[PDB]
Point group: none
Chain length 446, copies 2
Amino acid sequence: SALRTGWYTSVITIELSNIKENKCNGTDAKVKLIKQELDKYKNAVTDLQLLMQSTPATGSGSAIASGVAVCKVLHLEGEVNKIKSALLSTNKAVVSLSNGVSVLTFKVLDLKNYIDKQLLPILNKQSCSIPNIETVIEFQQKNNRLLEITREFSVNAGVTTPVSTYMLTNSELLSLINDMPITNDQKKLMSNNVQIVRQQSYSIMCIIKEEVLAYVVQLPLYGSALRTGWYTSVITIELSNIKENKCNGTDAKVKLIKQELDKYKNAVTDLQLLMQSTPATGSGSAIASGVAVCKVLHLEGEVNKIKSALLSTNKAVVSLSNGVSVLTFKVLDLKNYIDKQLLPILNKQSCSIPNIETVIEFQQKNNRLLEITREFSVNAGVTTPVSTYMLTNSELLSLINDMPITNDQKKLMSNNVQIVRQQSYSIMCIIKEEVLAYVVQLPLYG
Amino acid sequence: SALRTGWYTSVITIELSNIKENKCNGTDAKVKLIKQELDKYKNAVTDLQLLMQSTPATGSGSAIASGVAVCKVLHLEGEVNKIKSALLSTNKAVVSLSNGVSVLTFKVLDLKNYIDKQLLPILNKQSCSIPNIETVIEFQQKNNRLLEITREFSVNAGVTTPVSTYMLTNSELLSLINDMPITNDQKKLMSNNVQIVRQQSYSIMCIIKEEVLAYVVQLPLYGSALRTGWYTSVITIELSNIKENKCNGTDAKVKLIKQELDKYKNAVTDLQLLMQSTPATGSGSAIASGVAVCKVLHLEGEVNKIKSALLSTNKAVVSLSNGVSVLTFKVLDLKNYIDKQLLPILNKQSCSIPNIETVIEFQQKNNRLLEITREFSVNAGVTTPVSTYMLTNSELLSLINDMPITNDQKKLMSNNVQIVRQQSYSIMCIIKEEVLAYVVQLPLYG
């Protein structure tokens, strides 16, 4: 979860038999149990077709946006026939779509061949030839996977997670993992944590067309509801612009303050250097929403707009020149502390000796800045899970109670703060005009 | 077996009697047992004729492609008569086909002469003259070989292996061996292992035409199912291009690394020299598929294509400029180990003393390359069976699940890994742009 960098999607197909109503005289129980099982198969196909007419829409911020994008490509002309041909003699193939993208495809259940080549010919040797009870067991167990897959998709609007063994067996999941574009150690990692892999993966019903039932399974690439979007907030630390004041520092109490002041200046310059070296992200990056907001903060006067709004409060709604309103926070005011509370005590010429409790207080205030700087530095400006240094428990609960969600979702997030932090990102944005700003990107499940 | 270099084919003929329905009054049992035996003979001929109308097609990669090629030559004008004339007064003759190829032919059963000249004249001394019970046994045993040959071909689609004693007796097989174009010691080799020779040979029903039943037996030339084709994969080792760095090496730990580095460089140059000396193979060579793929790897930018595909993953499918998609493996990354893990520790000017565990680790990583190089060197760049150094157990299982074969064949190969290795070849291909590539060629039984 914390090291996932992308999504991997595969096409999972079930071969269907094109058989209409076969109403021949069925008297005994074995012929009826077969017919009642064929109705289950047919009702399962029509249930999924009916389910795919009410399919909810998905946005760019959805966790399954990539898997949904793959499903729509399967609706291009001849894609189903292309996959059908590639799986005629194999259970697994790589198919180059007309999108130009190569996708891994699976044939997990050949009900087309069982019904047409094995079940019906036995039944069609008489007036519904009385089959062996063993055959009734055999057809019943084969159809079970389709019925359970249909049941899962029906009670979950065609999107399920975790991915059950009916959607993808352990053998099929392992074969998929071994065919992923990851290193050998990553394939060992996922193969030893298939249960976690299932919990972090989605299975999306896609299409039924030309005797092919297909759903896409979406897996994580490493480097309880559906996340339907992202929520971005601006978190600000008020900075004090001060150049080094080398006065007469004799005792250790003055020296400690100057060491802490040097810690403060180093963190700002380290964060400045860090941002001048960040690589770029793609539209498919999980932090595209936050990165887009960061760049908006670089527009004219946006930092000043946020600074004025946070002058007399710790949290405000600011309407950006983007036209979007964003919630902004002020979590730490080092501008006010250093300039109005610390420097006046020390400075006036040569450094006045500070109180020992004063050295303590400055250390505690500056620590959160240093810890934030350290977390950003070792992760190239993007951290997850969002640490309590990035956003304290009090601040995070305050942010939740301002999100555009129903009251039930607010209590849902408030009781699962640890989970919320693990689905969220903190993205360093900018240092400009005595303001340190980073964007925290939280999940939306509605 | 790991020594077969070609195939030897021979034409085996059974002389057939052209007799239609002979419905004369048969009252007693001895006349009825003769007539019931003549029906078995006639049903056997029509069974084989019907069998040869459903004969499956064969490709150039088939293990019986050469034998199948010989059968079709027997369909040329006058070939059967040429073979019939050559076997009028002897059981074995060399015949120069209109193909220009000499083939060894056998007459193993003269049912034409027995029925026409000995059985029928006895029966045609009356209204189906009552024959002696001895004659009933004699005809019954003579017809038995034809019936058993017919049974084997019928339940095996006209191709059987191992070659039974009915297809070719021990006396006939030994005669064939001494007429092969091999050495006296090779003849002694096969004559002491006729059971193995039978297990590695094929019998192929060819034709029934002009009173001649002909099948071709295909034997190996030394230097479970039928192999219908070949599957080729590309196995890569990532090389580090480094010229000798003779720095101050005093202790034995530095000296050991430099010996191992010299082992590394010698292996590359030995393999380079080995490829510049390989002889050519023919279209009838068992490794023609692999060789053709090797040459495709010499097309512009193919090695770069595979190198990029294997930058962040150990296995990938690559579409060549040939238009054919091939599965590529990265089994050893010495480029990353030497350049990023070993040289940084040692180098910086004069060789830094390495940890003794470091010297251990380099030796184990380089050992596989040296063993692969050694195996290629002593076999002129083609090895079989494919040793575990060419392809480990993990890697071979990984490959099998990617082959274009049904799930049943994947389990069949996975449970018979040793057998798969013995039917496979490893062919050194190329060293180019820091990449060592050899093609591995596996059987296809479908």
